[PDB]
Design a protein around this ligand. Structure first.
Ligand code: APC
Ligand code: APC
Ligand code: PE0
Ligand code: PE0
Ligand code: CA
Ligand code: CA
Ligand code: MG
Ligand code: MG
Ligand code: MG
Lengths: 551, 562
């Protein structure tokens, strides 16, 4: 009865599904659940993209009033997780403390639930892998229910897809109200904190591991495919990917349905849903290299009104052979600017209808101290790390708070402003860069950064000869699955494109970049980082008009 | 030979190997066909198909024709209409073989050629011919070839509905002469000519065997059905195309390219988007608030456009800009001829050490005449599609030169056009309209491959109609396409030092249409901002320039294996 509470400290692997119905607040709801998962269950070491599929204020108050977890939070960076490796390859783990069933019983008891439900809205999903300290899936389900109830004070559905290699079907669970309190107290410092426990007792009816709908719901396979394509559970007839591929082509050969069209991958730049590949956002460049705060802030507002969705501020040139002037530090160039902008914006904020009108703010820095100060003072939304967080990976710690995730651009480069033009050997240029960006994403994702908040940038001009920059453009389709951010603006390789004073070359350069804006638009590049906002907006508006068929 | 005063319909084929001079050679041939055989009343595109200074001084000393050249415009041709439908015609003076005997006499020549063995530029033509019979025409044709002396081959593909095969042919060194003097004032060459003419086949033997004959004929007479053929030209053409795809896995069109001509050189249809720079003399001179025309500044602008990358200059002195009232004191001709004259001068001064094609945006015959006679221009840009004065068409042919023409669609004039925007079917009414204009120039001997289409963005179109014409630009995929969006109001309609932002937005909006045009493979775009447009096209072109067409798949496999 209380052998479910035995002293033994163990680490298990759980795979969860988080679903909501609320389009408006999906991000905030799912990420609140991510936070509570990380607080109350263990460590997030994988996430899928966010998807939209076809079959408020008290949250911010809740996060202030949470009971502490009996268990540690360790933010140190990890580079491998052994239990996860073991989970993936089906290696040896401890016997389940809960009674298992064989394949036949499971398959039978699954169908029986499916058929019953076959007698008797947009969904927003995300899956998670958690390195858990919770002893067993039922205990987990109790805590998961606590979390769902916290978030009500429907709105959030949290299912257990997997839990080690276990196979479990328990038909008639009834847990006495004091047993629930006893389970929650093992994991939480329990201290109205008692009345919640009442609602939970009728909620746990049975427990199926794997979850009943795991292979029967497209939206689950979609998420799992992002994270664990090669996983094979005893109870499944193939790997996650295979099962996923079959589901796609079957709907193409049992109906005439391309399932992808109804089920959209999402990325998040700040706090809203963006559908992958549906819009080319302009990112306006603000180089503060001496540029006076007031003037810098004027330029920011000129760019908002010229059409920029995002402003990318940098205080440190990375341009070829640039030696900076130590007279003034990066911090002192960027912070006063972002503070002034935050002031001006808040003055003129409550005078007009301007909240969604606020540009997402991006900082082009590799330096942890700079980003720590921006993040502490709520001055930025995105980290633009031209070293893909390799220069100081501690920075990745700054992308999470108790109730906040920040998004990040990972760019590819080699060397520094002085050596980079000399480091241009690649066995397989297009794929070496892709593979590198994937490894960097895997490292962030292993360390709890949501997959959907990570953007890829091939870094044109950084350790690329001009013909290699072009070739990276020519092959941009290899990023069709990923949120893609590129920066071609006023780079050398553009001039390399023309045939034959500096004002004439300045203009050829702006104009050559409008060509790459056109190309980008058709290639459905998600973000483009540009100096010339007005010009870029004009181009994208025209091309959008040409594409819009009128009724 | 005895019969007199009859008119016949004959289809010819013209061929050469000289890529460098295909235009000059086929165009000379044409001139001579029009001099010595009748009126050219149809042409095909020029095609490039895989299976020098002699001519200038030749043009001066030619023998005259016995029938009068007739440059008058026509709008139908009953005979030709009768040729197409296969209606009652006179009986053949030469001896007709029947169908099976023709079929087997042909196969024989084809088969003997298959065995006997162990870039082409083509152009078909239809002739309303005074000449009496296939064989006489062949004699005159052989004279024309030798008169041009392989350098030029001119076969006879049809003569009315005749089904003819003549097995053995000796023509007396003097029997040729009497035929040749029936049509010319003869003033050495017959010696060379004798054995040349061995036999005679009508239809020509290779008529349905050579793709490059079908291709050419499909332009002109797609629905034509000869007794000898199993179906219409269009069907045999389609069959030939699909069967090459099914049976040999070959896209026959890749090696058989449609050509259009701007000046003197070959252009490959859909292979390049050409910049055409705009020189408006009214705007160049009177936008200051100034009152005097400045030819120097104007010719300075021409040179500045050549260097910025324009392949073509479009000069105009009338303004069709909406609600714009042309200046009544200084005439079009005085805005235009002087600027052109100074240009041809300074071009010839700086010609020690590339010459831009010159287009003139006029609907006025007298203006065009003075320009063409003094060799000031290469192309007629007629925004009325030659309906303001169809006689302007005559000026597109000389005895030696041909000139190219842009036909634009419009309704009304600059004060009325904006109100004239009801179309039963916008996209197709305009295309049909342009097509019917082309049928009219062609019926009058304007070479097909010298006619360019322009939908006329902004000319009697609402802004959404201009966009719609762009959305549906693919309907011109078979045709040489010339468009002008530069700075038109419909660009602003696409958007969301206040007028400078608006003029910036407008140049930039255009560069977007330049890109779209580039990808839609528009042949010519007429622009104000040349440097900007060239920069755009250069960059798009470099992105498309692949080193190895396979590497993307190969590098992908290499990566997967590692
Ligand atoms: N792996 C698992 N994860 C979550 N709940 C499970 C489960 N196995 C069994 N259950 C039972 O089913 C209940 C889940 O309730 P809900 O999630 O609200 C049903 P639903 O969302 O309408 O459809 P779903 O079960 O297909 O998600 C749990 O309280 C528990 O009684
Ligand atoms: N309908 C026709 N038109 C032109 N020539 C014809 C003809 N019927 C027979 N001939 C004769 O056959 C010859 C045709 O071949 P030529 O033009 O001389 C070189 P070819 O290109 O190798 O032959 P091809 O064009 O038949 O392939 C002519 O010289 C002509 O005397
Ligand atoms: N992510 C990113 N940041 C940059 N910062 C400066 C110059 N280029 C770039 C670039 O191309 N990408
Ligand atoms: N052919 C052509 N000519 C023009 N002349 C003036 C203005 N626009 C145009 C145009 O769009 N097309
Ligand atoms: Ca944790
Ligand atoms: Ca004639
Ligand atoms: Mg559920
Ligand atoms: Mg030949
Ligand atoms: Mg021949």
């Amino acid at each position: 009865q209380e052998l479910i509470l035995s002293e033994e400290n163990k680490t298990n692997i759980a795979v969860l599904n988080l679903g909501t119905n609320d389009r408006r607040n999906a991000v905030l709801i799912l990420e609140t659940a991510l936070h509570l998962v990380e607080k109350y269950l263990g460590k997030i070491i994988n996430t899928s993209y966010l998807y939209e599929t076809v079959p408020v204020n008290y949250i911010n108050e809740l996060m202030q009033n949470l009971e502490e977890s009996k268990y540690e939070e360790n933010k140190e960076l990890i580079d491998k997780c052994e239990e996860y490796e073991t989970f993936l390859k089906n290696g040896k783990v401890d016997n389940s403390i809960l009674k298992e069933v064989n394949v036949e019983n499971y398959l039978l008891e699954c169908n029986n639930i499916i058929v019953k439900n076959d007698e008797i809205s947009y969904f927003y999903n995300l899956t998670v892998v958690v390195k858990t300290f919770v002893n067993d899936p039922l205990s987990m389900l109790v805590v998961i229910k606590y979390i769902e109830e916290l978030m009500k004070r429907r709105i959030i559905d949290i299912d257990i897809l997997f839990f080690n290699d276990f196979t479990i079907f328990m038909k008639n669970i009834k847990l006495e109200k004091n047993m629930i309190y006893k389970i929650l107290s093992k994991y939480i410092h329990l201290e109205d904190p008692q009345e919640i426990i009442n609602n939970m007792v009728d909620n746990i009816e049975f427990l199926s591991i794997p979850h009943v709908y795991t292979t029967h719901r497209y939206s689950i396979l979609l998420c799992l495919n992002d994270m664990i394509p090669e996983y094979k559970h005893n109870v499944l007839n193939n790997t996650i990917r295979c099962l996923y591929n079959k589901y796609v082509s079957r709907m193409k050969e049992q109906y005439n349905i391309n399932i992808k069209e109804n089920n959209k991958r999402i990325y998040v730049l700040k706090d809203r849903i963006s559908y992958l590949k549906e819009k080319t956002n302009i990112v306006g460049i603000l180089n503060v290299n001496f540029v006076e705060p007031k003037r810098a802030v004027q330029r920011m507002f000129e760019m908002i009104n010229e059409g920029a969705s995002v402003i990318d501020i940098g205080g440190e040139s990375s341009a070829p052979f640039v030696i900076p002037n130590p007279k003034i530090s990066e911090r002192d160039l960027v912070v006063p600017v972002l503070q002034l902008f935050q002031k001006e914006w808040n003055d003129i904020k409550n005078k007009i209808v301007k909240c969604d009108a606020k540009p997402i703010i991006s900082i082009d820095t590799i330096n942890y101290n700079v980003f720590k100060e921006c993040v502490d003072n709520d001055l930025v939304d995105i980290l633009n790390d031209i070293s893909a967080c390799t220069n100081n990976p501690e920075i990745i710690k700054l992308l999470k708070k108790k109730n906040k995730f920040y998004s990040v651009v990972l760019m590819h480069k080699r060397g520094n402003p002085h050596t980079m033009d000399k480091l241009t050997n690649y066995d397989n240029l297009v794929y070496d860069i892709k593979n590198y960006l994937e490894q960097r994403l895997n490292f962030l994702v292993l360390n709890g950064i949501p997959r959907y908040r990570i953007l890829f940038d091939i870094g044109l001009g950084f350790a690329k000869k001009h013909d290699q920059s072009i070739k990276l453009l020519q092959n941009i389709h290899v990023y069709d699955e990923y949120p893609l951010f590129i920066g071609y603006s006023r780079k050398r390789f553009i001039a390399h494109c023309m045939n034959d004073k500096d004002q004439l070359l300045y203009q050829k350069n702006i104009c050559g970049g409008l060509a790459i804006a056109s190309y980008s638009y058709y290639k459905k590049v998600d973000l483009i980082r540009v100096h010339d906002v007005l010009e870029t907006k004009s181009v994208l508006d025209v091309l959008t008009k040409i594409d819009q068929v009128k009724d």
